[PDB]
Amino acid sequence: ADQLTEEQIAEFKEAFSLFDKDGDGTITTKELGTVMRSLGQNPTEAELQDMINEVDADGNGTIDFPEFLTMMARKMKDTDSEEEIREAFRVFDKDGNGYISAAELRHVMTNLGEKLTDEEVDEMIREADIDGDGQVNYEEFVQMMTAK
Amino acid sequence: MSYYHHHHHHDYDIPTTENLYFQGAMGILGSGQKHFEKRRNPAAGLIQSAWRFYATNLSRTDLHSTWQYYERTVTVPMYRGLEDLTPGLKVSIRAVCVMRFLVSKRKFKESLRLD
Numbered sequence A: 001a002d003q004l005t006e007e008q009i010a011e012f013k014e015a016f017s018l019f020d021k022d023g024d025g026t027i028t029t030k031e032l033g034t035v036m037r038s039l040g041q042n043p044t045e046a047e048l049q050d051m052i053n054e055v056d057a058d059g060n061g062t063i064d065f066p067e068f069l070t071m072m073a074r075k076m077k078d079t080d081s082e083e084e085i086r087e088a089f090r091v092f093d094k095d096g097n098g099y100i101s102a103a104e105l106r107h108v109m110t111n112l113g114e115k116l117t118d119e120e121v122d123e124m125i126r127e128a129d130i131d132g133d134g135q136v137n138y139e140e141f142v143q144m145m146t147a148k
Numbered sequence B: 001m002s003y004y005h006h007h008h009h010h011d012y013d014i015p016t017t018e019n020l021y022f023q024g025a026m027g028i029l030g031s032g033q034k035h036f037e038k039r040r041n042p043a044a045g046l047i048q049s050a051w052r053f054y055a056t057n058l059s060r061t062d063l064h065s066t067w068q069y070y071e072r073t074v075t076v077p078m079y080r081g082l083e084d085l086t087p088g089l090k091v092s093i094r095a096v097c098v099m100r101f102l103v104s105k106r107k108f109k110e111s112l113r114l115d
């Protein structure tokens, strides 16, 4: 119903403009690898193939603008509708009252799903200035993700 | 050491194996909890990937001093005369990060399914 957002599309269009590099108007898997190297990352060819799997309705091996727009736009639906990240925090609440214990929080983040070391979970706690005591709220994390 | 850490005392040491195996007992901790366990796997992956995604853009003017120096030093980039701001760099890194976020959403939905 609501009109689509042009200001947000403009960011997507600049990303599309940067990403095409052989200059044929469309973004293929080896161009994504070319972008990755330019960001100092040399992932495996299989990883580059796999991370593209989402994008296309018809599977055309190169990423057209609306599909690229959907890849970029899809993240915006999580930003616009914050229900997914808010619910993603909610499924870990041991007591059901909105406050999560700090000790509980480290083990389920560190050892599960994507695995990250203690130094990486330190950044999440410290840079959001979370307190030493066990009660940590997760609403502030969603607001940090969406406010800026 | 008269006191015992675990009341059951089934074995001296516990062995953990990565492979699932063909046959295993489900176990009981309250079976309804296991519905949350399947859901938690995409939630855990999305939270980790989102934090990794946000950290790349965390700061420009004062913080991310080291990142700023590493970006300035590289030879390939041209003198940035035309545009003072560098959002395009921030957009470019956070654009590649979400491909992992989205595919982790599909893969961890597959992990939710147990097929």
Ligand SMILES: [Ca+2]
Residues within 6 Å of the ligand: A020, A021, A022, A023, A024, A025, A026, A027, A028, A031
């Ligand atoms: Ca191209």
Ligand SMILES: [Ca+2]
Residues within 6 Å of the ligand: A056, A057, A058, A059, A060, A064, A067
């Ligand atoms: Ca297509």
Ligand SMILES: [Ca+2]
Residues within 6 Å of the ligand: A093, A094, A095, A096, A097, A098, A099, A100
């Ligand atoms: Ca709680």
Ligand SMILES: [Ca+2]
Residues within 6 Å of the ligand: A130, A131, A132, A133, A134, A135, A136, A137
């Ligand atoms: Ca606290």
